[PDB]
């Protein structure tokens, strides 16, 4: 896009709408009922998967093991103990998802999913994240924050929204970046496991609709680690799952700090938190 | 025979085993050479995890083969 000629408000909005129409999956729409800003930044490309960068070692398939549930009929959910993909799970083994495809309330933060080495189909009920976005999402302009995302359809508790995608970069590259400290950032640390907290997803230049999610001290969606290579824990999908039922046109917000601890009472940074929640901490970190 | 085990951190261990050896014995040898408890071990070969009771020969793991060691998650 060598726009040596000025693009008007209408043309910028139409180019962004064309980009949204070209996103893989169900439709994504653009709404601005606040101001005259045509659209989010045009210097962006939506990507349908992670883009790894130099210095980041990608998941090694040799450390990946599939399951043999094809003999059961394709990974039965009533027989989770027979699935190899649930080996590293708890002793009360159970799949993350229910019969209707939503993550269970008691499911842990880690979702082990089937991979290329399994004997099941893509219709395996443990391949929810790999099937991708299913709801029609609308990018709208929030009153106090920047751009947010809402759902045009009802999102029951446990529904999968989308993944946080972008460039996977080292901590060194993220340090050469992080000039975004001077006040928006698209850096999401892949820090689900303190034993494998090495990389970071930057959704600044490349990413997904999820990069328009805003923070709330009372979130309605949260982060899960969707892992296909169960032997690897430095790179994994940052899947979004609704933690409570989301009414239509209600803004999709998740906690940037993730799940708070429980023991340390004590144990701003970017901006005054304007999520408007009754419990609003007022200090958003990220 | 001589076999190899590849770990996540890049290290590669050599092991002296036999086709009659069980995967539990291989995990015990890995413990004796590296200090890793057998219960916290997942051995992987040709895209399949190796079960404790089975033997190496049942997986057609011949000499100079390379198994891949994955350390189990405990936290949650």
């Amino acid at each position: 896009l060598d726009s040596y000629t000025h693009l008007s408000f209408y043309e910028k909005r139409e180019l962004f709408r064309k980009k949204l129409r070209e996103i893989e999956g169900p439709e994504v729409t653009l709404v601005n009922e606040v101001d005259d800003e045509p659209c989010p930044s045009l210097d962006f490309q939506f990507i349908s998967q992670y883009r790894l960068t130099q210095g980041v070692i990608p998941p090694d398939p040799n450390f990946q093991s599939g399951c043999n549930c094809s003999s059961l009929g394709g990974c039965d959910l009533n027989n989770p103990s027979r699935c190899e993909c649930l080996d590293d799970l708890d002793e009360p083994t159970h799949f993350a998802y229910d019969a209707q495809g939503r993550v269970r309330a008691d499911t842990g933060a880690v979702i082990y999913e089937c991979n290329s080495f399994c004997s099941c189909s893509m219709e395996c009920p443990n391949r929810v994240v790999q099937r991708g976005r299913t709801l029609p999402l609308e990018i709208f302009k929030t009153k106090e924050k920047g751009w947010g995302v809402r759902s045009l359809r009802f999102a029951p508790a446990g529904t999968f929204i989308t993944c946080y995608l972008g460039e996977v970069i080292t901590s060194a590259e993220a340090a050469k970046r992080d000039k975004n400290y001077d006040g928006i950032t698209y850096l999401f640390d892949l820090d689900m496991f303190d034993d494998a907290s090495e990389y970071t997803v930057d959704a600044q230049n490349y990413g997904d609709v999820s990069r328009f999610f805003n923070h709330s001290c009372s979130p309605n969606i949260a982060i899960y680690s969707a892992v296909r290579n169960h032997g690897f824990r430095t790179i994994y999908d940052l899947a979004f799952f609704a933690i409570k039922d989301i009414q239509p046109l209600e803004e999709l917000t998740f906690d940037y700090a993730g799940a708070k601890d429980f023991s340390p009472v004590q144990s701003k940074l970017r901006r005054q938190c304007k999520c408007g929640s009754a419990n609003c901490r007022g200090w958003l970190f990220g | 025979m001589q076999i190899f085990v590849k770990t996540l951190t890049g290290k590669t261990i050599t092991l002296e085993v036999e086709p009659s050896d069980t995967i539990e014995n291989v995990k015990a040898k890995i413990q004796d050479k590296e200090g890793i408890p057998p219960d916290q071990q997942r051995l992987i070969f040709a895209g399949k995890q190796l079960e404790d009771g089975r033997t190496l020969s049942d997986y057609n793991i011949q000499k100079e083969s390379t198994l891949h060691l994955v350390l189990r998650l405990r936290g949650c």
Binding site: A109, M192, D194, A257, D261 | -
Partner: peptide, 15 residues
């Protein structure tokens, strides 16, 4: 902490 988005860790879960 750091001015980045985080999962929150392993032991804590969705709540």
């Amino acid at each position: 902490q750091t001015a980045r988005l985080s999962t929150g860790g392993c032991a804590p879960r969705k709540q």
